Amino acid sequence: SMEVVGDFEYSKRDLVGHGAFAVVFRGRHRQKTDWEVAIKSINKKNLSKSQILLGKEIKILKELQHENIVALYDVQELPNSVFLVMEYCNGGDLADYLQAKGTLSEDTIRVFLHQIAAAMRILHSKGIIHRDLKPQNILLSYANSGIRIKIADFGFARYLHSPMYMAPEVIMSQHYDAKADLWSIGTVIYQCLVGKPPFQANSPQDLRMFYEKNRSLMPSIPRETSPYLANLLLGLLQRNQKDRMDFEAFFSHPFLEQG
Amino acid sequence: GGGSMEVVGDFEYSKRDLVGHGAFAVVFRGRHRQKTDWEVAIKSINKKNLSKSQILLGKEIKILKELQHENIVALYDVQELPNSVFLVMEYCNGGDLADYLQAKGTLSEDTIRVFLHQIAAAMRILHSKGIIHRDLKPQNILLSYANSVSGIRIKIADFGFARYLHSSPMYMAPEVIMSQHYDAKADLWSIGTVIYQCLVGKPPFQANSPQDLRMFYEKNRSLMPSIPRETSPYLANLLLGLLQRNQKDRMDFEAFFSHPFLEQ
Ligand SMILES: CNC(=O)c1ccccc1Oc1nc(Nc2cc(OC)c(OC)c(OC)c2)ncc1Br
Numbered sequence: 082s083m084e085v086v087g088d089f090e091y092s093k094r095d096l097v098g099h100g101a102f103a104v105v106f107r108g109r110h111r112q113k114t115d116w117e118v119a120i121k122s123i124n125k126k127n128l129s130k131s132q133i134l135l136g137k138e139i140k141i142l143k144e145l146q147h148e149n150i151v152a153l154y155d156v157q158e159l160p161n162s163v164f165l166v167m168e169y170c171n172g173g174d175l176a177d178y179l180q181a182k183g184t185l186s187e188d189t190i191r192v193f194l195h196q197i198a199a200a201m202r203i204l205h206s207k208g209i210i211h212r213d214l215k216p217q218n219i220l221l222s223y224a225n226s227g228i229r230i231k232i233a234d235f236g237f238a239r240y241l242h243s244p245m246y247m248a249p250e251v252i253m254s255q256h257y258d259a260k261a262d263l264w265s266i267g268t269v270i271y272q273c274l275v276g277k278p279p280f281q282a283n284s285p286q287d288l289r290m291f292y293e294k295n296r297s298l299m300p301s302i303p304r305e306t307s308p309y310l311a312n313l314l315l316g317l318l319q320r321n322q323k324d325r326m327d328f329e330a331f332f333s334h335p336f337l338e339q340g
Numbered sequence: 341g342g343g344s345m346e347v348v349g350d351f352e353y354s355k356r357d358l359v360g361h362g363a364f365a366v367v368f369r370g371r372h373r374q375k376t377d378w379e380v381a382i383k384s385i386n387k388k389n390l391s392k393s394q395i396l397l398g399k400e401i402k403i404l405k406e407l408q409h410e411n412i413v414a415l416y417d418v419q420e421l422p423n424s425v426f427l428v429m430e431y432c433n434g435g436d437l438a439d440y441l442q443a444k445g446t447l448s449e450d451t452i453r454v455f456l457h458q459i460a461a462a463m464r465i466l467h468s469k470g471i472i473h474r475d476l477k478p479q480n481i482l483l484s485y486a487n488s489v490s491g492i493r494i495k496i497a498d499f500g501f502a503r504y505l506h507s508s509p510m511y512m513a514p515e516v517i518m519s520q521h522y523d524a525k526a527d528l529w530s531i532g533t534v535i536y537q538c539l540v541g542k543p544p545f546q547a548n549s550p551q552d553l554r555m556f557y558e559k560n561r562s563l564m565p566s567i568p569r570e571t572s573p574y575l576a577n578l579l580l581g582l583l584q585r586n587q588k589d590r591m592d593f594e595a596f597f598s599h600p601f602l603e604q
């Protein structure tokens with residue numbers, strides 16, 4: 082007994098994991114059975130009691146079509162549930178990969194970052210900010226160097242909006258988070274290299290007031306670190322977006338294009 | 341769509357009965373097909389145009405469904421064709437507040453209190469659901485008549501710019517962490533500008549461009565609007581507390597909902 086979702090099918094045995102509102106299964110196309118997919122089941126009533134904008138996630142995933150961004154193939158709406166048929170990444174999340182390997186060579190990090198950067202180029206050209214990049218949201222797919230990286234979870238994402246009645250905080254806050262992803266990529270690279278994030282805290286509100294009071298300094302870069310990787314981390318991990326490396330510097334950064 | 345008539349679920353409309361357009365939607369006066377005395381607004385939204393925009397119709401629909409109040413424009417139905425999406429909404433036979441002000445110039449404090457009582461009732465609902473409109477303005481405030489000024493009923497519309505307040509994210513950018521709730525009081529400013537325009541006949545703060553008004557506010561830690569000398573103490577207190585550049589210093593919702601001006 083397989084459950085059918087449009088031209089795809091899955092077994093309830095083949096559970097991958099959960100979201101807050103979604104269950105995810107390993108599935109396949111019904112004719113092209115070698116084609117593996119992830120199928121997210123999302124209860125419509127639970128979702129309508131949340132602040133989740135699935136419409137937005139779907140709109141953004143459709144707009145993106147890139148080998149380093151998790152593919153959405155299909156959306157099926159039943160009266161109870163919504164089903165997302167997506168690319169299956171057979172390597173899990175980067176979080177679990179780091180748990181397994183500890184730290185990564187600069188060679189490995191360059192490979193991962195080249196791919197992340199390729200994804201970011203697409204995001205940037207469409208004016209989309211992810212805002213929630215983290216190892217749990219970076220998925221891994223193996224071929225048979227062999228690892229391909231895929232950005233996932235556009236739940237927190239937003240479009241850059243590139244008025245006498247509008248609140249001054251709103252006018253003035255345009256583009257405030259335009260460089261957010263560059264910080265995130267920084268923290269992720271940092272963790273890859275060093276083996277913990279640059280900035281930990283006991284709670285969400287503890288990290289808020291840390292950043293709010295600039296009780297936040299450049300973190301410890303190991304003395305092993307190559308000049309280019311160190312330059313990159315320093316320019317990404319700037320508390321003020323005013324002072325943070327911008328996208329064009331990042332895409333074309335020396336660290337990304339060598340031996 | 342050669343023909344003059346279109347069917348939209350249980351509703352229908354004639355293309356002759358055009359009300360107007362926004363950026364993405366064309367809006368018609370329609371009716372229920374059986375209960376033909378029931379007038380509705382039918383918004384037609386081209387799906388290809390919409391897919392080239394940053395408009396989140398899914399969000400607008402989710403928010404309209406969640407809201408159910410006499411001072412918030414009602415959503416009755418959503419129909420999807422391969423070309424178009426149709427919203428069947430409450431028809432407001434009075435147009436927008438912008439056109440009402442164009443017609444009347446300025447409004448008595450009595451009139452403003454009636455309008456503001458209703459707007460405030462809508463805000464109470466938004467606030468209790470943790471929704472910020474962010475785009476309140478006379479063009480987005482619609483008017484509905486029975487058969488008169490107390491005869492007028494107000495309906496907030498256009499949740500296009502609206503958003504939900506999200507009540508160790510080690511990986512998250514500090515600007516994002518720190519910017520939570522930054523715009524929590526935005527609608528209070530907006531309602532201030534709208535009241536101000538109702539009273540005086542212009543917005544409190546005009547400029548040469550959008551970026552000129554940004555740098556005016558940016559480099560003026562507290563600005564004071566010109567309150568006409570005739571203005572009652574309560575209305576003046578209200579405007580001054582709403583029109584604070586810094587959300588830190590701006591009247592909060594509980595002061596606003598229970599403000600002396602609203603019960604007098
Ligand atoms: C943010 N990541 C998700 O969307 C996601 C989260 C939980 C479960 C599945 C998820 O979606 C997805 N998950 C995969 N591959 C995958 C595969 C795993 O094991 C081999 C795995 O380890 C349990 C894993 O951890 C989450 C993910 N691929 C595509 C999507 Br689309």
Ligand SMILES: CNC(=O)c1ccccc1Oc1nc(Nc2cc(OC)c(OC)c(OC)c2)ncc1Br
Pocket residue numbers: 359360361362367381413429430431432433434435436479480481482497498
């Ligand atoms: C917030 N404005 C809109 O969504 C809107 C804009 C253009 C056309 C219709 C619009 O939606 C709506 N418009 C009405 N009633 C209405 C009626 C008008 O004349 C009698 C009118 O003047 C042309 C008007 O335009 C400002 C609105 N009701 C519900 C919706 Br839902």
